[PDB]
Amino acid sequence: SPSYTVLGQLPDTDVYIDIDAYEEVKEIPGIKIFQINAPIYYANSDLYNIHTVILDFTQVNFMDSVGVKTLAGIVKEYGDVGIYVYLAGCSAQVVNDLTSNRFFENPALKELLFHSIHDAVLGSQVREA
Ligand SMILES: [Cl-]
Ligand SMILES: [Cl-]
């Protein structure tokens, strides 16, 4: 798909890349890592034993209201079955867009933000169930 890319980990590193870019790259059991390559409502359309979903926002330069609403729905619906959706690599601007569109109306959602994919992976290691 062009709207998202499944990422895996280069073994024994904090390097995460396209699962298809190199043979030894492997997904992490219990975690799904998706790189957003288009506005999330496009990638979400494709979405339509995992404990964590990590969304890599490194390619995202801004978000619009529809996208934030879509993301809020993804986070809520996964959360309602105990699955955490983490946001990795959001720029200051993207976080401003999330905030402006009231994504953090519940300030607890701030806890879903991580600087890097690896940080997000480590964040999932131990947490309130
Ligand atoms: Cl968006
Ligand atoms: Cl990263």
DSSP the chain: --SEEEEEEPTTSS-EEETTS-TT-BPPTTEEEEEE-S-HHHHHHHH---SEEEEE-TT-----HHHHHHHHHHHHHHHTTT-EEEEES--HHHHHHHHHTTTTSSGGGGGGEESSHHHHHHHTSS---
What does the alpha-carbon distance between residue 6 and residue 54 come to, in Å, rounded to a whole number?
10
Ligand nearest to the CA of 42: 1
CATH number at residue 49: 3.30.750.24
Q: Determine the structural domain holding residue 69 and report its residue range.
A: 1-129
- Total domains in the chain come to 1
Way it was determined: X-ray
CA 14 / ligand 1 centre spacing (Å):
27
Residues with CB under 5 A from ligand 2 (ion): 116-117
Q: Report the first-to-last Cα separation within the chain, whole angstroms.
A: 32
What does the alpha-carbon distance between residue 38 and residue 31 come to, in Å, rounded to a whole number?
21
- Closest by CA to 87, choosing from 19, 99, 66, is 99
Ligand nearest to the CA of 17: 2
The rounded radius of gyration (Å) of the Cα atoms in the chain is: 14
- Closest by CA to 32, choosing from 4, 60, 52, is 52
- Which residue in the block uniquely carries the two structure tokens 């390619």? 59
Q: Give the full edge-to-edge strand order of the sheet including 113-114.
A: 16-18, 4-9, 31-36, 52-56, 84-88, 113-114
CA 40 / ligand 1 centre spacing (Å):
6
CA 81 / ligand 2 centre spacing (Å):
26
CA 89 / ligand 2 centre spacing (Å):
6
Ligand nearest to the CA of 98: 1
Return phi, psi of residue 16, to 5°. Answer: -120, 125
- Measured over the CA atoms of residue 118, residue 123, residue 124 and residue 125, the dihedral's sign is positive
Ligand nearest to the CA of 119: 2
